[PDB]
Amino acid sequence: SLTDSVYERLLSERIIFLGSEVNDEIANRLCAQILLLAAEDASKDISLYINSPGGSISAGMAIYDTMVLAPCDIATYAMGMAASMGEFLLAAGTKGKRYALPHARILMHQPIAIQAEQFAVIKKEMFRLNAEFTGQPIERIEADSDRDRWFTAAEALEYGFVDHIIT
Amino acid sequence: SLTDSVYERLLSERIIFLGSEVNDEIANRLCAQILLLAAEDASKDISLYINSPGGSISAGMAIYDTMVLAPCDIATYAMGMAASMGEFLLAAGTKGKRYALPHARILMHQPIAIQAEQFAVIKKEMFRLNAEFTGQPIERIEADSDRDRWFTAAEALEYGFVDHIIT
Amino acid sequence: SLTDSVYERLLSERIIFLGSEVNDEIANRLCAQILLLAAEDASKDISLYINSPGGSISAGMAIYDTMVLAPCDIATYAMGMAASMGEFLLAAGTKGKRYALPHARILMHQPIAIQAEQFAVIKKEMFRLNAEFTGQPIERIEADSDRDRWFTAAEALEYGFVDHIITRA
Amino acid sequence: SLTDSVYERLLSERIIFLGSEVNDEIANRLCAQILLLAAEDASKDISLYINSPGGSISAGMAIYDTMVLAPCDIATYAMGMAASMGEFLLAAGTKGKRYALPHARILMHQPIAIQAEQFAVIKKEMFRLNAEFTGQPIERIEADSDRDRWFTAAEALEYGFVDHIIT
Amino acid sequence: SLTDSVYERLLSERIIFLGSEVNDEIANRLCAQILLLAAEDASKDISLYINSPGGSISAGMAIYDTMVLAPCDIATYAMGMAASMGEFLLAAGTKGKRYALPHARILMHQPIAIQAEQFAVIKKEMFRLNAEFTGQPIERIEADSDRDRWFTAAEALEYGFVDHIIT
Amino acid sequence: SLTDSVYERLLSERIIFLGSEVNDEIANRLCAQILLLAAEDASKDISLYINSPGGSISAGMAIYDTMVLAPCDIATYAMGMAASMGEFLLAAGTKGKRYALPHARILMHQPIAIQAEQFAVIKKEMFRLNAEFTGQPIERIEADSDRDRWFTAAEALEYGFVDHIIT
Amino acid sequence: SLTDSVYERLLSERIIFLGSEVNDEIANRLCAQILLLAAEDASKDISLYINSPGGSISAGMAIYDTMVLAPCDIATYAMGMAASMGEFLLAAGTKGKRYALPHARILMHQPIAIQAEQFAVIKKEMFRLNAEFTGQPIERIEADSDRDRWFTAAEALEYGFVDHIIT
Amino acid sequence: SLTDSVYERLLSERIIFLGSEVNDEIANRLCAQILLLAAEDASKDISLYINSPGGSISAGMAIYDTMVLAPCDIATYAMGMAASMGEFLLAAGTKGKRYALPHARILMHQPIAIQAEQFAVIKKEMFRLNAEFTGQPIERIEADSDRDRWFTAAEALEYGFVDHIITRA
Amino acid sequence: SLTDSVYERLLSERIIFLGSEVNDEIANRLCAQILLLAAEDASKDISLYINSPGGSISAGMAIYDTMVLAPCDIATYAMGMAASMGEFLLAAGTKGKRYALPHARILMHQPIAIQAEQFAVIKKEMFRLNAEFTGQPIERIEADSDRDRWFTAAEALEYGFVDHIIT
Amino acid sequence: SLTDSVYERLLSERIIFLGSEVNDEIANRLCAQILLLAAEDASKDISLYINSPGGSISAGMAIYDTMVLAPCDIATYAMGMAASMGEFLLAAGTKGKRYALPHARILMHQPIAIQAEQFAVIKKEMFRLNAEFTGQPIERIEADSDRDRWFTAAEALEYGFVDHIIT
Amino acid sequence: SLTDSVYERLLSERIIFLGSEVNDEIANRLCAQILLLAAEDASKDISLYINSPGGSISAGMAIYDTMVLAPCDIATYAMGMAASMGEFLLAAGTKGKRYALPHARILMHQPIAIQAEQFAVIKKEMFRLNAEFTGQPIERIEADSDRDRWFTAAEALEYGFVDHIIT
Amino acid sequence: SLTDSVYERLLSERIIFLGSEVNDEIANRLCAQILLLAAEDASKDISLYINSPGGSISAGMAIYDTMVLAPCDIATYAMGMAASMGEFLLAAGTKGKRYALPHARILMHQPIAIQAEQFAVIKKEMFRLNAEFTGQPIERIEADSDRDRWFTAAEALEYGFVDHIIT
């Protein structure tokens, strides 16, 4: 189909998209692409464009782990919305190669008994990493996720999610 | 489709994925990929990436037997989840080449009369191999399976599921 | 699709799969492939990998006829399950080249006036060839089939379904 | 699809299948395959493999007509079932080159005002042609179809639907 | 698909097919095929195999109109049924190159106020042309269509629909 | 439901409707109503209103037989359309009690081996009965059925399908 | 169902509704309803409420014939829209007892060879009765439909579709 | 629903209908209605109207057994078509109470190892009883069934399927 | 169903509902209801409960005409929302008996050539009668609709939609 | 529905049916009917008619248990097929009142480690009961069921499943 | 259905159920019932059983508006869950006649430019009434809403949601 | 529906059924029924028949609470299987009136992370009451749930779930 064709073509310029909610299908497809590009050429950059409401923390953490695994830099771009795990992957890009498009919106969100155990531990780790990424203190991240704090491109550079606003 | 093209292209790099729950279909498709790579080139390594909640034991042992069958080494990577047969297949990679990614989770799991006796036989055999893979006694594999013990990447290295945590 | 794509790719390596219930359409696909390989090169082996709960005797018997028809050696491998005609077809492989992988299972199974006549003929022929295949008496075969006897790899090599349990290739 | 790729490849070897009921669509498909192969090369054999419960008489007579039309030799093979029109098209192949696989079954079967008129003509014409192919008298063909007489390879060879039983 | 693939491969052989009902859909497909062929090579013959219950008069005339328009000869073949518009298009083939297969069958059939006016002239013109193609008198074409007259191959040759019976 | 209730309260007034095409289901349903009414009172009039394109002769004949079977007189009313079997059943009403509404339209329409046989039998019986109903001769019934002759309420009164045109 | 329940209760107050497009099924049920109320009490009025896009002339004309047939008075009410056959049936009420609600809108609209034939005579009839209904000349009725003339309650009283406008 | 209401209304008059393909479902419903009428008043006739293309023998035979069970007489009426089991059930009505309407037609028709066995048995039973009902030899009933013999009402009266052609009720 | 049984029983208490959108189906159902209640007892009140997003203007007006038609008073109650035509109808209630519940909200809204004219006419009439029901100039009504003004019960009372807030 | 009406009315005569495959819903319904009948008149017989392929053993056993619970005699009739649990329930009727209709057929059929446990128990138990019911030895019950032994009415009477064959 | 049959039977006991999510349909049905019961007898209590996760504030408030409207007393019963508007309507019970079942749980949940406008006003109104109903200060109601406080039956008596824990 | 009718008729006998998975719907169905029966006659016994694979605790707790609330005794009957909450409800019956049919089976089963907290309190409270019903100590209830302990009627009577086995 046209759509897939254009993505394939973009993938040949080392440009990948997160354009939906993060879940296991998407995560796998994305990690795959990252493994491919990395395998194809370890020294050229990858560009990850993001327009995503976020989703599953587990999914996003696998993606992030793959980002970290790849030797090349990964540039990230907020294209329309980076919310929760969308924000996190945006913030997780190679430092100095994180970009917000001028009207992108960055949104923070607060994301049996053993499932709660497994959830709590990785929520904490995501909060930890988000602080590392943004330079913000961990308590700033925590409160701002509770209050569903949203950002303009400008406000987001301020806060530390991105390094550039590309006019 | 894009997704399929991307997996095919990863296949050309000898990179393979267990991305969903293990069943007869996926088993057949994985085995098929292993035989393919083994036939293409006995010498080079296959890298199997795992992010699976697992499922059926026979399905799982079918993949295992194929992995053993392949003359080349299989590297296994815990990418997201490795639970039940997902874990088993991970621990089943070539000594020296089992990797956990820093935020992966390993979950051990407790997984017509003729069916009962068939299941009892593989169940037992699965414990036996798990113990072999991990270096643990059978009895600690059984008790840890009975209770649904889960592992962080760290905890998983200690136990014997993986050889390295790769960053 | 990927799946299909590796099967085609795997076909060019002379490797084929019976990965599900042997019915009429699957039997045709399979015959087609044997014919194809046979016709491509008539003296290189074909490797048939079985993981299948069997199916109709009729379709099973069609795959078998095509196996005999084909000049080359057809090597059979029990991958997961070889039940009914999956068992029959495994056992039907070129003598010496029938294999079980260590955790494969072999299941035996008891498989209008004029349909009944047809069935009776083919059912009797099937028991007769299973005997020929395994070295067993027809008596064993019928009674084992009756009680749905099943086999591990080891037990299956003993009985005569395969010639080797293979671990490393 | 894999199924289709195989038949195409098999069709490059001048091998065609009749693997289902004979309706107008299958008949058109098959007629087309014969014309293609006869146009590609009119001196080389075509191999029709038959495993089908037969079906529509006029659809069967169209295929038959196309075999007759095709300059080249058409060899036929009873692969599983050759029933009614399937049996008709088996017996209809080039004499000397009609084969039965050992466990094939050959079944004979009895196949508005104006539809009856056409069917009556066509029915008589196919009894006539069955008799000519088999060497059996016409009245033998009719009594046998009426009582659904079926054959093993052995019985089929002797009666005259086929020339050789291959192994 | 296999079926479609075969059809395209036959187009390279300048063989085309009318093998379903004649309507707007099919008519266009078939006019397009004739146009392609005449564009590919204006001098080389096109073969049209007919097996079709006919259908819409206006669709049939569009096809006929395209046939006349093609510079090259168009051989026509009665393969199954050639009924109503199916019969018209057969009889419309290049004089000398109209064929019946031995068991082919030719059927004749009688085939808001402004709609009726339109229909009346198209109907008249069809009769006129069917009279011209067969060398029969218009009266006989009308009466014969009224009474659903049908034709064996031999009867069709005698009447004028075709020039040859192929064996 | 509304409709059902209305037909059912009309059944209490001994009024029956043939308001769609005659098939085996409508047959069985009509025959039932007739039988019920007849059973309820064997000597009160039944009123059958008709607005139907007709349909199956065999079905038409079963309703006819049942009408005849019923001790009581059956009145018939061409309410909109009485075509083919619709016409026939309108004609079959008790002499003196066939009615046409002023804008009613009567249409005459001429409607395996064993199937043809049976059909030819009742076709002839149908024609014969139509003649008897209308006083017309058989050859006129056939000739008119061939050309799909139709009738206004007036034209139909003259010909013998009805006894009165009601206002 | 409630809806049917209200229509049933209304049927008891001798009130019926043309609340949709006039087709064969609707025409059937409406005739059935007239017949029933007429059978129940031939001396008492029926109130027919209209809010209809109209429809098929034949259908509307069956309804009309049935109204004429009903002995009792039928009062008509333009409730929402009376378009086409909706207008005709409105105008067809008993002179004296034809009503439009203050915001009722009345729309005129100009509504195989045998098909055309039939249509033409009933189209002529319906024009004649619209003329007689409204007391207009037939020429004006016709030209007015040509141009899709529409009427307010007041314009329609003036033109002759109705006798009163109710408030 | 109206349809269902008149059949119910008709049950009240001890009239029942066989107006479609005889299968397990239809027979279940029909056996029920017979059992209900017999339970209602055991001394009183049940009229059965047949307009059916027939179908399954077992289903047919189940209706038959219920007919036999019911203490009361069952009058059968070929209303349009009585074919195969339709024919059988018509022929099975109480002697002297089997009727055909002027234009009824009657069609005879010739209707895993364990299935074939049970089928053979019931088939034989079906021919024998048909022979008994019509007064024909088993041989004829076989031959005719074989040849799909049919019958106008008159030809049917003469063969034994029915006792009367009824014209007015 | 319970939902319908409840409404039937409310109808029997002379209580009607506008609970959904105003499409023609609904307005028909609702008119029928008012027609019935009037016919049952011309003297007793009708209580109409509104909780509706409004909808079609013709449908609106048909209901309105019917309400004017009924001799009895109709009380109107704003149960939750009364928007567009739902508001219009609310305000159409008998003077002194238009009510709002305390947390009801009233919402104003702006509600081929020949259709346009009709719409313009209904639309103008709508605005006028709404100016008259509330006591506001047509210009206030129009402008307030243009900007989707909404009202609390208190505000609705103030503006003139209603006469009482009930508790 | 007619069907339901009839079963309902048959239930008033204390006549129940097992007419499809035994499964939870049907067993539940059947138990309910037995409980109902039993509660209505604990001294008068229930007649159970069977034509069922049987089905689940647990469901069958719950029906059986309700039969034992029910204080009144429960007569059983083999109508079409009494197979597996159908056979068992038939055999389980009050001794002296089990009936076969002359063309009834009786079939015997051989009917997560925790699942196997539970099943072994109920199976053994069901053979025991079937032995007691029929007076045969348990090991003849088992071999018979093993080979799917079937029975004619006479054979069943001989074996011990029923007490009379009714005619 | 049996379920509807029970609910209506319970309606006769002036017992009603809010047993799913409060949406518009539900609120319409519940307002209807309350109204119906009020009409049937204004002097006798209504009992409202709540087992509901709540939902729409404004649907919630429609029900509440009808509750106040009804002159009779309304008992409320926290039968299982009373969350969001479920809690609210529970607490709207006629003081003294608000009950909780021993294992009931109460939950408080924090529940276009113009949608926002209306929503802010109704949220405020709800908070005001929750305070009113329970005797807590508006600030505790809000603060306790944010974090999503849940309550056992006892904690619920204590806060003011209900008056008695009924055993 | 026959199924519904039979349950309705059973309600007159004060017999109710838990014959499927316990959930929100069923729970409400069942509480409704209990509330009805109680309201109808306060002393007369309710009889609950249980054939249920359990379900959710919350739903089961609500039913339990309605039972306790219900003035009259409730008899419980283990029909085919009482598992999970099916067991609970069975065991929750009026003491001395809890029954098991002989082939019945009692199965005990283990049934925004703040859900865990709610679920923890309620798991504990079920265990408590389950302990109290049987006479087993809390800990026995836990471990026996943990390994899925199943019981025969005999085993269950002696373990405390039921008081009597009926035959």
UniProtKB/Swiss-Prot annotation, chains A, B, D, E, F, G, I, J, K, L:
Where are the catalytic residues?
Answer: 84 (nucleophile), 109
Naming one, the record's GO cellular component terms include: endopeptidase Clp complex
Could you tell me the keywords of this UniProt record? Cytoplasm, Hydrolase, Protease, Serine protease
> A Pfam family for this UniProt protein?
CLP_protease
Its UniProt entry gives the catalysed reaction(s) as:
Hydrolysis of proteins to small peptides in the presence of ATP and magnesium. alpha-casein is the usual test substrate. In the absence of ATP, only oligopeptides shorter than five residues are hydrolyzed (such as succinyl-Leu-Tyr-|-NHMec, and Leu-Tyr-Leu-|-Tyr-Trp, in which cleavage of the -Tyr-|-Leu- and -Tyr-|-Trp bonds also occurs)
**Gene Ontology molecular function:** ATP-dependent peptidase activity; ATPase binding; serine-type endopeptidase activity
Q: Which GO terms describe its biological process?
A: protein quality control for misfolded or incompletely synthesized proteins
| EC main group | hydrolase
UniProt-annotated location(s): Cytoplasm
Q: What is its EC number?
A: 3.4.21.92
Q: Which family does it belong to?
A: Belongs to the peptidase S14 family.
Q: Which PANTHER family match?
A: ATP-DEPENDENT CLP PROTEASE PROTEOLYTIC SUBUNIT (PTHR10381:SF70)
Q: How does it associate, per the subunit comment? A: Fourteen ClpP subunits assemble into 2 heptameric rings which stack back to back to give a disk-like structure with a central cavity, resembling the structure of eukaryotic proteasomes. Forms a complex with ClpP2 and ClpX.
- Function of this protein? Cleaves peptides in various proteins in a process that requires ATP hydrolysis. Has a chymotrypsin-like activity. Plays a major role in the degradation of misfolded proteins. Degrades anti-sigma-D factor (rsdA) when present in a complex with ClpP2 and ClpX. Does not seem to act on anti-sigma-L factor (rslA).
Protein name per UniProt: ATP-dependent Clp protease proteolytic subunit 1
Q: Which organism is it from?
A: Mycobacterium tuberculosis (strain ATCC 25618 / H37Rv)
User: What are the top taxonomic ranks of the organism?
Assistant: Bacteria, Bacillati, Actinomycetota, Actinomycetes, Mycobacteriales
Name of the encoding gene = clpP1
